[PDB]
Amino acid sequence: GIKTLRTFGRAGLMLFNALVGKPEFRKHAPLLVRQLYNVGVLSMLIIVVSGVFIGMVLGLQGYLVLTTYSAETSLGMLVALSLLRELGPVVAALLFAGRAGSALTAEIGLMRATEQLSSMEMMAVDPLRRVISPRFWAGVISLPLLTVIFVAVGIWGGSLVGVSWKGIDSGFFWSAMQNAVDWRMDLVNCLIKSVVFAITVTWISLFNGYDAIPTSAGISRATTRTVVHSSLAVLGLDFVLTALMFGN
Amino acid sequence: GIKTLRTFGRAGLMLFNALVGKPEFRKHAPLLVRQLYNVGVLSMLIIVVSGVFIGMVLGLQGYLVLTTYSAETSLGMLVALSLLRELGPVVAALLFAGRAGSALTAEIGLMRATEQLSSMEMMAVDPLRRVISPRFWAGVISLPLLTVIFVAVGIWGGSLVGVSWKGIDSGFFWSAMQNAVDWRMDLVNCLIKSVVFAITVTWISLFNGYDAIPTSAGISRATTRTVVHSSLAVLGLDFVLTALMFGN
Amino acid sequence: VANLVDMRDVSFTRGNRCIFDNISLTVPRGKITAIMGPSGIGKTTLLRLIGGQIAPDHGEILFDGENIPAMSRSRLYTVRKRMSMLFQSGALFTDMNVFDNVAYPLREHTQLPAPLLHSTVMMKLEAVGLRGAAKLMPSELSGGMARRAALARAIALEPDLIMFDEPFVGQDPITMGVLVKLISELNSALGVTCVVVSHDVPEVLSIADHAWILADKKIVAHGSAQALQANPDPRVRQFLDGIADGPVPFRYPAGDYHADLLPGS
Amino acid sequence: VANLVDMRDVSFTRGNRCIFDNISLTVPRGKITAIMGPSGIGKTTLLRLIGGQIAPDHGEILFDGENIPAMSRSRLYTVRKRMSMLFQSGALFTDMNVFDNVAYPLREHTQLPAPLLHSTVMMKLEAVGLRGAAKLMPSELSGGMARRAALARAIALEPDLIMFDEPFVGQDPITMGVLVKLISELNSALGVTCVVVSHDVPEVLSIADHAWILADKKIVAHGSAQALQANPDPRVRQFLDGIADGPVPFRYPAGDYHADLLPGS
Amino acid sequence: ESLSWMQTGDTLALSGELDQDVLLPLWEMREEAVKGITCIDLSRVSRVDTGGLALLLHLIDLAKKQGNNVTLQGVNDKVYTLAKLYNLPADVLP
Amino acid sequence: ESLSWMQTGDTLALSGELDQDVLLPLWEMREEAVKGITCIDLSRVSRVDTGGLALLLHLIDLAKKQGNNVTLQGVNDKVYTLAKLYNLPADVLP
User: Fold this and answer.
1) B59 contacts on A by Cβ (under 8 Å)
2) Domain tally for chain E?
């Protein structure tokens, strides 16, 4: 009943009034900067370091795959293209859903419980257009950027695997074949997925913090509801997206 | 300074007194059952459904890989063996670190803030041996089980891709080749990783809930610290593990 | 108009547990009224109601004439410029420090020059008292200084109706007295008409010029503090001093107490 | 031994903000003492200290003879069987409902038969008052019934020293009175010697048989409630009624108030 | 630390501490304990605790179980003290 | 809703509402406003609000800035009321 239609109607409503309205710009730009810093800039290490390992794994693990077929040159073509088509926009989506897909609902849900939101709503400044929106636009412009940083560092780690650990390919790895890998349509397809995942994550990462029953046991269960839906729907939309993006 | 050595000494200490002690069994078994239900049984949908999609993706995405090399029979050998060597113990580790790697610190951290823990400590019953340990052993025996459930359902989804979506291989997919894939050493190597990841996750998933500054803004930041470390160290130990498990 | 806000006859249901019922209240201008009742009876809901942030089921709440519900949802903001809740727990913005945490409604509404606004905020801070705490973060202040700085920022715009959601709640008598003196000196200095919804009677009635008392589903008594102190009414006489047992049960309802000890008596 | 617990001379530092200093206290058996001071001065720390759960820096705290610190960390549990903190906010276990949430120390310590323990818990519940609330979950009760059920479970084992960490804090006077009657009737019925650390004076002093008063870094006054009410001491006279301004500053320290308004005066 | 009870025909003479601990050895054979008991005199009962009250209550229930008006002799001030505290009705304690 | 101010030689005759809103048009040219001002009479000032107090304080600062003992005539009860409330020292308001 509740989640049947009421919860989702409320979740759509709380957004349909969260962006479209007065086009006020020079007011939110300072807020947008700090939301970007907290959500995106601070979370850098959550995808820098974690970009390394998931790269190096796909390196070392992928290494012992085509080495069985002795095609060690295709490494980047199998490494990069992999973490550039699927593993980027999903692993750096789950690491995001952690560092900023959770901390948000545990930051804006906290407001609704410490009553910063109702007090804002008490001044004529609307809480949605002034607190939801700067966070929302920090998310949907940091996540796809985060994914690019993630893929770059993952490629670098895969290099350190396929180069430093095994001095096997220097330019023959990337400078030779990744030319046939770095094409535009690929980054296009990755960025579309990253944008849709930003939308979804930092939407439900911010509908809970607004729909959270305001108590110290409400925001904590809501953070869990975020890291649950922000992987359920993340993978679901990844499946549907890759279906409609490659099953042609 | 603090995290330099004090924080990690405290994190080791709070565990060295959390398992070894009086061997009391028939007291914790009822608690262990409910910790298993909350942490493991309830979180089933967090890895059942999410096992499907990450499978079907690796199916559909993997499908359009060897189809380029027209080796569609090796699908299971490339699908299963993949999500059975790397993607299982990591994706079902991050989904775990979400549903139960977070909710725990946001459940036991909440205690330390609502003072259930100090009140327990006030009765002669020690809070560690009675609250940390049932959760700890629910984790380190649910996570590897969760990974098995995850890999099974992921294989089923990959099937639905490579079978239902494309009626290409019925037994030639699995009943033919996965014989050369389902060997013992593989499940051994996967279960070792799953066990180490249970240890790590549900250790730092429970050191924060015990080291959390007890306030509604302490447990929420601590839940974030858990979903951060429980992916940083998850991927780090995955890298080191797969290195020492395949770089031979 | 004699009063500042007339809550004529409000019944609010909140789903299945009807909170209010045909309740009647009249906050007069210049008078620092109060409303008190059982804890958690939902009086904070009554406050958030007079702020429009929630609508009544069936009732006419008239802030200074027009109805709060009959508002443009931006005209509502226009008039809400003439209000300020003072929530408990401060409700300071955790991000910006107190100085900025006070300035917020100014920068939001006035076109004030920077050095002008700085001094006005540095002045309201001394007013409430925590002037030296401009640089400090809200997560750093105490639980009392939090409410005090929240008050200071709440008086900005001179709201002419600044309602207090149980401010002296969980507060030692020194901070309790600082609070009960601040929000008294304000009404005795500004034209503010505070509406203190609270339940710390020996403190509220010290300054409350016209109090209301509500039982579980309606208001039972009102009047002056002195004319209320002498009320011979069970539901009222109970709360007014905590006789701990009367028309509000001290013992939770249960069955027969006998087989409870003797399962299969 | 005349007293039940002697905190001879405790200085507790808590790192860089020294909480206590050479403080001296003597809770006598049978007397429901109290200690009161500024809010958040760390008196709950003093309580958690008398529970051994934190050690003093340099001091002799002697519960019934032997020292709390000089304990086997399991002998500590043996003696702690003779204590029970009654923390605010209930501290009920969120999982098990009240009935079980009360039984917990029994099942932990006594070898009580199941139908015996059931009736003993169903009896302590009526004692505190919330008997009908056995089936209800702790996340379901009010904030007052939470403390009451926590009390009921705290009296199990008849702890002979049951200290109250600010129980009537943020509580309406009806629940305040229910509480102040419960923990009074207990000491007047059992041999329990409650130590109420709190800061709601007109409530605590109603039952407190020997109170202590502590300034920021030491205890300043003690005695009987009546012999304390008439104390001519600034730091004490302030807190005892909240004169809101005295040796404890009402105004936070700041600089000159002049250039503050006139940057570059 | 001790508990010793004898059916003396009509009187159930128990003696000791009567707490949650020393209570078990009595709680089982409560039936034969209240076999043909007319009343119980808690005379040489040093102190009494809550569990002791509970068990005594059950014993009274048994005294009425076969059907018999029981009474309590040599009772202590502390017992009736708790009986007021626990608000025990005077139809189950007498 | 209105504000109008004239330097009348020695007296700074401002008149109006003196709130945060009508205040700006005065705040800029404050210098020439206190060009050769000896005192300010806030006589036809209907009401006064906090921002008005702040600006007036700055004006006094300027009156002393070139160096001149200023005074305030025709002041209102409400002004000194707030001046007590805001605890403004009598060296900056006079």
Assistant:
1) none
2) 1
